[PDB]
Amino acid sequence: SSLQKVELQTDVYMVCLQHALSTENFEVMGLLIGNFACGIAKISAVIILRRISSEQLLKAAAEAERLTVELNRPMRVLGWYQSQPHISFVGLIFSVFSEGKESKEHEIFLNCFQSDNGEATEIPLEIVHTPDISDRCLRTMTDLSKILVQEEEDMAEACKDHPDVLASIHNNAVRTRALIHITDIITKPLVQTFEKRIALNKLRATHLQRQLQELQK
Amino acid sequence: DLLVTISGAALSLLFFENVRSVGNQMGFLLGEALEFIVTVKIHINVEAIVTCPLADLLHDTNHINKEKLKDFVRDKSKQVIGWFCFRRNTTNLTLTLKDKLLHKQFASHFSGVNGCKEDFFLTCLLNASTSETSGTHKFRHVFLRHNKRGMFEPISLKINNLGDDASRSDYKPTPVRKSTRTPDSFTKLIESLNLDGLDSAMLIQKAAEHHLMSLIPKVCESDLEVAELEKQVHELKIKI
């Protein structure tokens, strides 16, 4: 019952990394979901947080239950993750956007630790192989687009119905660019990524089929 | 929290009118007050200024003739949110006892009409000194209000320019309260356009250009009108 090791699925690793690379300005966050067995916390899913805070944990604990019955496995909020650009629970810190001025080399750090009462120590992490990208993981990183859009729609709501015409034109101009900015940077590349993933899979699939066919002979 | 805002156009007109006058000069600040929710923020915008000889407002006494003050400002009393005082040949930005007295009187008289509290009635102290060889001209100014604790504290002034204005998210939040009860000259122009994004912004700017170009002779007319009336009054005074 004592935490000894953390095992992170590769497809969940991809989601967290993708979320961290969404912006180099602010620290993004989310909640690690999975099972705790023989001293091993296995993360098989993740929840993207809108930005310590509460209540969201209740929505996460409920989602964890929805993940239990669907995946037929014990699922609970094991902890959280957060990004770090230009510089009782399980914590993951994805240090991103760090490049050399002359070397042109980019670095990405991933630190794993156990946190309780503001205290923490290092915890052994292993990224565990997955034969694919989970249905939940695909949906999770598509939600990133939806959440970002939702954040913007909320900001424009508070400034809606502005009496001054010049301000209304300005606000609609800001909302338009911001939505486009989300689509071009987040939504569109994800669309292309999925499309290319499918096409390039079938390219390898047909390649292996030709290999499989002649290997027997 | 309080912030005074003013455009380059309005501020230039203020300094333009000050360097014109023969000696010291005073007048009134015209504008509105906006409230923003965050606590509540107060933006006091300075729209325009108007000069006035203090002697025309005095009995005979150093007390402001409330009767004479109403006759000068007239229907523009609901816009007066402050007054200014300009002094040549001084780098000293100082509140005189006489200035304090004028502030209190002007605050009490206008607070009921302008739709603003007596708390944030403005006082603008401007000056203009020159160097020994008059090769360097220095212009200083500051905005003040009378505190509830009996203090004349300086208020931050923000000159709205193309780099940074007082509405800086990139959205423009809707103000919860406005003390303005006077029709805006520019918003009346947009209403005349009878509009029903980018295309709308183009027309407004173009219409503003034609409007701005038509105002130019009207400005010159009203200028020479007062200029002659300023001479006739002055000529009569010297005559006697």
Residue numbers in the entry:
A (entry chain A): 4 to 54, 64 to 99, 120 to 249
B (entry chain D): 5 to 42, 54 to 75, 77 to 184, 188 to 215, 221 to 264
Paper text:
BRCC36 consists of a functional metalloprotease JAMM/MPN+ domain followed by a predicted coiled coil region implicated in protein-protein interactions.
Optimization of the CfKIAA0157 construct boundaries by deletion of poorly conserved C-terminal residues 290 to 471 (CfKIAA0157ΔC) yielded crystals in complex with full length CfBRCC36 (residues 1-253) that diffracted to 2.55 Å resolution. Following manual rebuilding and refinement, two highly interdigitated CfBRCC36–KIAA0157ΔC heterodimers were apparent in the asymmetric unit, arranged in the suspected super dimer configuration. The structure of each protomer of CfBRCC36 and CfKIAA0157 consisted of a canonical MPN domain (residues 1–165 in BRCC36 comprising an eight strand β-sheet flanked by three α-helices and residues 1–180 in KIAA0157 comprising a seven strand β-sheet flanked by three α-helices), followed by two non-canonical helices α4 and α5 within the predicted coiled coil regions. The MPN domains of each associated in a pseudo two-fold manner centered on helices α1, resulting in a unified β-sheet and “fused” MPN+–MPN− superstructure (buried SA = 2902 Å2). The helical bundle was tethered against the fused MPN domains of BRCC36 and KIAA0157 via a mixture of hydrophobic and hydrophilic interactions.
